[PDB]
């Protein structure tokens, strides 16, 4: 089976991604990174909550899967099966190796792929949930449960941005009225006041 | 006429059940390979027997795994047959030349070749030349 996660907690090796030099990597435990209502329009889910790592460590693909399931399950219970959208912001790209010791020694010890981990930085966001403002308490509580599936310390931070966009919530509505933020599915498109005037014409037509 | 010797040097343990080897001054093809490490802790030896490339005579040898063994050089090519005279088959080259040297095989193979020629169909024989001698040992037909 798997070694305990304590054996691969620290970013001890250079990144070792699945590439043409690293063949036979088993598929990561986590495959679905986005769940809930991914289609919900930018304006439907303004409130955003992030789980932020406070250590420079490795999070295994299995750990990412368990937290995703744990957060999803609770959010369905508290807000509904379509009252939010969860995105896992870490993709396990670092391949960890195992030198199988089956009853020779350390001769030729370079191991074989065992799994994948996501090298996380202090302050890198681990997972994000966007929902309505009235569900802030649940998003903290849901993210609180998912914290117990990870090693190390994590912090829950309610973002001042609007939804999953990179624009402040307190000014998001103003930019949309002034056509500097066109709703484009999940996110928005920023309209730079540059480029051919035809594009400005269509927007204001 | 390249200086490359017909003798080709190669190890013994890196020889398979298909490889060509020269045993007792005779080109041979390996038909069995079994290694063996005698002594509690000594060098493993490899026992290998090769059946000749031309003759059917098997040949046996014992060599330390590490030791090296000569590998023969084979010039193989197949040409269509046009005419049989005095036991000397007449052959045709891709270059366009005709040499009526060599000889039909001295067994059931050779007799079976000539009766095909007498009937007349898609015929072309291979020319195997190792060391200094030659043997025509194979038959082929077009489609």
């Amino acid at each position: 089976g798997r070694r305990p996660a304590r054996c691969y907690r620290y970013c001890k090796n250079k990144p070792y991604p699945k590439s043409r030099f690293c063949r036979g990597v088993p598929d990561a435990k986590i495959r679905i990174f986005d769940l809930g209502r991914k289609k919900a329009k930018v304006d439907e889910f303004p409130l955003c909550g992030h789980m932020v790592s406070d250590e420079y460590e490795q999070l295994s693909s299995e750990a990412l899967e368990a937290a995703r399931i744990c957060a999803n399950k609770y959010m369905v219970k508290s807000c509904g099966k379509d009252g939010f959208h969860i995105r896992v912001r870490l993709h396990p790209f670092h391949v960890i190796r195992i030198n199988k010791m089956l009853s020779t020694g350390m001769r030729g010890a370079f191991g074989k792929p065992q799994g994948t981990v996501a090298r996380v930085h202090i302050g890198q966001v681990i997972m994000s949930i966007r929902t309505k403002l009235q569900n802030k308490e649940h998003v903290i509580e849901a993210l609180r449960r998912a914290k117990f599936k990870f090693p190390g310390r994590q912090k829950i931070h309610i973002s001042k941005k609007w939804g999953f966009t990179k624009f402040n919530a307190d000014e998001f509505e103003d930019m949309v009225a002034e056509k500097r933020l066109i709703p484009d599915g999940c996110g928005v498109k920023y309209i730079p006041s540059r480029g051919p005037l035809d594009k400005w014409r269509a927007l204001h037509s | 006429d390249a200086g490359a010797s017909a003798t080709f040097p190669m190890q013994c343990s890196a020889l398979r059940k298909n490889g060509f080897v020269v045993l007792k001054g005779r080109p041979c093809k390996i038909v069995e390979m079994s290694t063996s490490k005698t002594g509690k802790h000594g060098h493993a030896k490899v026992h290998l027997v090769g059946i000749d490339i031309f003759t059917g005579k098997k040949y046996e040898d014992i060599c330390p795994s590490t030791h090296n063994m000569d590998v023969p050089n084979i010039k193989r090519n197949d040409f269509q047959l046009i005419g049989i005279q005095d036991g000397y088959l007449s052959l045709l080259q891709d270059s366009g030349e005709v040499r009526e040297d060599l000889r039909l095989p001295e067994g059931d193979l050779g007799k079976e070749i000539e009766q095909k020629y007498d009937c007349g169909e898609e015929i072309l024989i291979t020319v195997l030349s190792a060391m200094t001698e030659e043997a025509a040992v194979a038959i082929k037909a077009m489609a």
Binding site: - | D1, A2, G3, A4, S5, T7, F8, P9, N68, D94, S95
Partner: protein
């Protein structure tokens, strides 16, 4: 490797480029009266067994081809040995390569 049977190259005795007849050098027959052989026979005489090494660990699967270039000038039949790189296959005056022709299977 294909090398032509003739080439125009420098002739040392003529002091100028001349046509040369190109053959392949082959080792001559040992004289048996060469100093080294006369010593070898004298050393091997009598008892003692083999007195000189017998090389066995051969490794080269090719040889360097030496071309015997002969000046075609009738008054200067000078010969010079010119070596080329190692090659498994070598022929003099082979049919030249052509482009854009069918493989012919």
């Amino acid at each position: 490797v294909n090398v032509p049977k003739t080439r125009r190259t420098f002739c040392k005795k003529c002091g100028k480029h001349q046509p040369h007849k190109v053959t392949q050098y082959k080792k001559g027959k040992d004289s048996l009266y060469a100093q080294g052989k006369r010593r070898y026979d004298r050393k091997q005489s009598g008892y003692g067994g083999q007195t000189k090494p017998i090389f066995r660990k051969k490794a080269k699967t090719t040889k360097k081809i030496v071309l015997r270039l002969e000046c075609v000038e009738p008054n200067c039949r000078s010969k010079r040995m010119l070596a080329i790189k190692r090659c498994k296959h070598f022929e003099l005056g082979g049919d030249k390569k052509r482009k854009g022709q069918v493989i012919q299977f």
